[PDB]
Structures are given as C-alpha cells and as structure tokens.
C-alpha cells in the first residue's frame, strides 16, 4: 500500500554538503576543515597503538560473544566512573554513583534524557549554552523535554560572554536542568577558566539547578585526564550531584565501536541501586543490551596498567598536535603581516575553533583557496597539518586583509 506517500524528504546536512564538495575538488592543496574526527600529521585516520594491543589480546583469549548485562560490562562501567570522578573521589569510594554503558556519547545523552523525562518531576526545561553541538537539540526534544538557552559565546571577542552567562543562569527558575560541556566546548572551543568555573558552580548550587555535564573530550583537550575533568569534579566537591555523559570516541579513537557511559550521582549507595533498576527498565525496550567490542577494548586499556600508561602518552600526543597547529597558525598569520588579533585561536581548547570569519570570507576561502569549512567560521583543527598550516595562514590573511 501507499502508506508513506505523505513522507517528505528531510533536509540535507550542511556538514555533509561541505565534505561532498571537498571530495569533488581536484586541487591538491584542498583542505577539509569540516572533519569531525582526529587526523594525524598525514591527514589520515588514527587507531591508537594501545587499541591494536587491546584488540589483539581479546582475539588471543578466544572470548565468547554472549550478551552483556543490560547496564553493560561491569569492568567498563566501574573504570568509566573512576576515570571521570578520580580515584580518591568521595563519590566514587562511597559508591553513590550509578554508571551504565551507553551507545557512545550520543546514546548516553539520550538515555539520560529519557531518564529525566520520566523521573525528573521538577521541570522539563533544559538550558543549553548559545551555541551548542547541533545534536543536543533533537536529543532533548525527542526525549520529550523543553529547550532553553543561556548566553555563552561572545562574537565580539570569540571568547566567553561571562557577563551574559552569569546574568542568564542567575535568572534560571530553581530546579531546572542546565547542560554544560566539561571541556573543549563544541563548536566554539571556548571554555571557562578555573575562576569562572568556581563562580558558575556557586550559582548552580545557589539556584539549586540539576547540572548535566557532557564530557566528550576527556584527555583529548589539554592532554591531561585530571585537568580535563576539573570542572566536573569541582561541582561534585561543592555538593552539586550531577548527571554525566562520557564518550570514548575521541580520547581512544573508538569512533565506530560506540563506547560511552551515562552516570548519576546519588545521595548514597542505597539510592544508586534504585536508580540503576529504573535505568535498566528504560534501556531494555531501547536496545536491550549494548555493543560489547568498544567496551571490551576500553576496559582492557583502563584496567591494564601497561596499556593505560601507553594510552596517556598517546592521548597526550593527539592533544599536543592540535595545540601545535593552533600555535603555528597564529605565528604564521603574524608572519604574513596580519594586523588582526588572532589570540582566540590559541585561547580556544580542543578540536573546534571559531575563527570569527564571516560568511563571505568563508566563501572566498572555499572558492579561491580550496579550504572547506562551514559558513559559521568554524574550523576542525584536525584538518590542519604541518604541511599546510602555512597555506591556511596565507589564505586567512588574503581574505581578512
């Protein structure tokens, strides 16, 4: 029958648009700055060394393919909580958290969203920073929640609109939900500094808000696992019982294996068990039980001292290269004689950098230099390499002069 005749073609992804054009282009100087995953100095995908080793170990052990418990691989969940909270964290040692395996960060966000829709009786409003990762909208919207915003990004400075944020958060009706990026804000790269974080916590705590941390770049941002989880741990220390989403897509290069976890900070171990039971009832009818590969690999690395050690060197390598490219970019623009202030480029943290380029300049860059990026002036630092940072500096200048 003609059941779907009324179904219209959904809109095309602007992001896919840029990568399709990049692919068509024959100029060997082409650059893809819309890329969403890490790339090495050669512009190639990168499977960590400790990943290959973990993998090799699994093969050796001739493990079965049996179903994992609903909540996932217990060695993976425990290790996940420990990674996030810190070993000597009171939350962790008291076992007053509940961690469940989710389908990477996205799945983990969704599960958390479905959990709040069901049990967070106090409000349906989720406040996102302006701007946020595109997916954040439909995630919360599809789960049945209401969307709100708080100023975050400042276009004047390509930095934190600290005054704007504080004024916005200050007017948040008590017992509302606020989504915060732990580090390496997507898509701006603009993160609060320690001092800003401390004032943010104070008000979150004061207005008695439910803080929902999105931690998708732990270790990948600064190169330090402890530094990256700083804000999140600060909140929990100040008595803010958060909810959290962790992704291993970037820090482990696990992209397609989809490994992540959803965590709930509870009053105690008693309550944690109750929440856990409820999280299980929710997930069953979603997908029953999670993909085991990614978790097995992740658990082995975090759980195996020789592997974990290698993992930290490797993760650090990734982060150092991105910083390097940022550094080189600013220095090269000066070298080109750019009068403009490009500090933001080096103040910004992680994979994404909001250049401050305007839509017209982006166009010149694409049309004239074969540099592919979105019209918002957002560049993926992963697409920069030692071999082309110069070229990019050149082009940016040409179009900004």
Ligand X SMILES: Cc1ncc(COP(=O)(O)O)c(CNOCC(=O)O)c1O
Pick out residues in 20-59 that bind its own copies (CB under 8 A). Answer: 36-37, 45, 47, 51, 55-56, 59
Residue of 228, 250, 311, 342 marked active site: 250
Give the number of residues in contact with its own copies, rule: CB under 8 A. 75
Q: Which stretch binds its own copies (CB under 8 A): 181-189, 289-297, 318-326, 330-338?
A: 289-297
Minimum distance from residue 364 beta carbon to its own copies (Å): 30
187 is a site residue for its own copies (CB under 8 A): no
Nearer Cβ to ligand X, position 260 or 330?
260
- Provide DSSP, 133-161: -TTHHHHHHHTTPEEEEEE-EETTTTEE-
Ligand-binding annotation for 378, yes or no, is: yes
Distances (CA, A) of 385 to 38, 50, 122, 326, 338: 11, 23, 48, 10, 21
Q: In angstroms, what CA-CA distances link 333 with 327, 353, 384?
A: 10, 15, 14
76 binds its own copies (CB under 8 A): no
- The residues near 237 (Cβ < 8 Å, ≥ 6 apart) are none
DSSP string computed for 85-134:
H-TT-HHHHTT-EEEEEEEHHHHHHHHHHHHHHHH-TT--EEEEEES--T
Segment near ligand X (CB under 6 A); pick from 99-107, 203-211, 328-336, 369-377: 99-107
Q: Which of 61, 274, 340, 401 forms a contact with its own copies (CB under 8 A)?
A: 274
Nearest to 396 by CA among 382, 380, 383, 377: 377
Q: Residue 342, annotated ligand binder?
A: no
User: d(Cα 203, Cα 196) in Å, to the nearest integer?
Assistant: 11
- Looking at 101-109, 147-155, 334-342, 367-375, which segment touches ligand X (CB under 6 A)? 101-109
Of 239 and 285, the one with the shorter C-beta distance to ligand X is: 285
Please give the backbone phi and psi of residue 179, each rounded to the nearest 5 degrees, phi first. Answer: -95, 125
Footprint on residues 189-228 left by its own copies (CB under 8 A): 208, 210
**Stretch 102-161 residues interacting with its own copies (CB under 8 A):** 103-107, 110, 119-122, 135, 138-139, 141-142
Cβ atoms within 10 Å, residue 67: 10
Task: Tell me how far apart the alpha carbons of residues 169 and 155 are, in angstroms, rounded to a whole number.
Answer: 19
Nearer to its own copies, 120 or 162 (CB): 120
3-state secondary structure of 389: helix
Is 133 one of the annotated active-site residues of the chain? Answer: yes
Nearer to ligand X, 36 or 317 (CB): 36
Structure tokens of 146? 């209401």
Question: Per the annotation, does 133 bind a ligand?
Answer: yes
Question: Of 133 and 342, which CB lies nearer to ligand X in the complex structure?
Answer: 133
Return binding residues for substrate.
Answer: 36, 133, 186, 378
Binding residues for ligand X, per CB under 6 A? 36, 67, 104-106, 133, 181, 186, 214, 216, 247, 249, 260, 288
Catalytic residue positions, numbered: 133, 214, 250
């Amino acid at each position: 029958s003609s059941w779907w005749s009324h179904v219209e073609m959904g809109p095309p992804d602007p992001i896919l648009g840029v990568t399709e054009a990049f692919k068509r282009d024959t100029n060997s100087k082409k650059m893809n700055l819309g890329v969403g995953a890490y790339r090495d100095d050669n512009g190639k995908p990168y499977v960590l060394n400790c990943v290959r080793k973990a993998e090799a170990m699994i093969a050796a052990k001739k493990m079965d393919k049996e179903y994992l418990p609903i909540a996932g691989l217990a060695d993976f969940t425990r290790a996940s909580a420990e990674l996030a909270l810190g070993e000597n964290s009171e939350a962790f040692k008291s076992g007053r958290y509940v961690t469940v395996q989710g389908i990477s960060g996205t799945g983990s966000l969704r599960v958390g969203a479905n959990f709040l829709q069901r049990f967070f009786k106090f409000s349906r409003d989720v406040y996102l920073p302006k701007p946020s990762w595109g997916n954040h909208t439909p995630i919360f919207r599809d789960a049945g929640l209401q969307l709100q915003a708080y100023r975050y990004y400042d276009p004047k400075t390509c930095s934190l609109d600290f005054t704007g944020a504080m004024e916005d958060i200050s007017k948040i009706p008590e017992k509302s939900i606020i989504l915060l990026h732990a580090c390496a804000h997507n898509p701006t790269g603009v993160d609060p500094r320690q001092e800003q974080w401390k004032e943010l916590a104070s008000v979150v705590k004061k207005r008695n808000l439910l803080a929902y941390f999105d931690m998708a770049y732990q270790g990948f941002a600064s190169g330090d696992i402890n530094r990256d989880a700083w804000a999140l741990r600060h909140f929990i220390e100040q008595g803010i019982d958060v909810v959290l989403s962790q992704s291993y897509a970037k820090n482990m290069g696990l992209y397609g294996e989809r490994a992540g976890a959803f965590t709930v900070i509870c009053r105690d171990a008693e309550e944690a068990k109750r929440v856990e039971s409820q999280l299980k009832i929710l997930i069953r009818p979603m997908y029953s039980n999670p993909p085991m590969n990614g978790a097995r690999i992740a658990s082995l690395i975090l759980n195996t001292p020789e592997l974990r050690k290698e993992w930290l060197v490797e993760v650090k390598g990734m982060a150092d290269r991105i910083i390097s490219m940022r550094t080189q970019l600013v220095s090269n623009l000066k070298k080109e004689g750019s009068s403009h202030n490009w500090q933001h480029i080096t103040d910004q943290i992680g994979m994404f950098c909001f250049t401050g380029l305007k839509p017209e300049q982006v166009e010149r860059l694409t049309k004239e230099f074969s540099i592919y990026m979105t019209k918002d002036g957002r560049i993926s630092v992963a697409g920069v390499a030692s071999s082309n940072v110069g070229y990019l500096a050149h082009a940016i200048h040409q179009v900004t002069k």
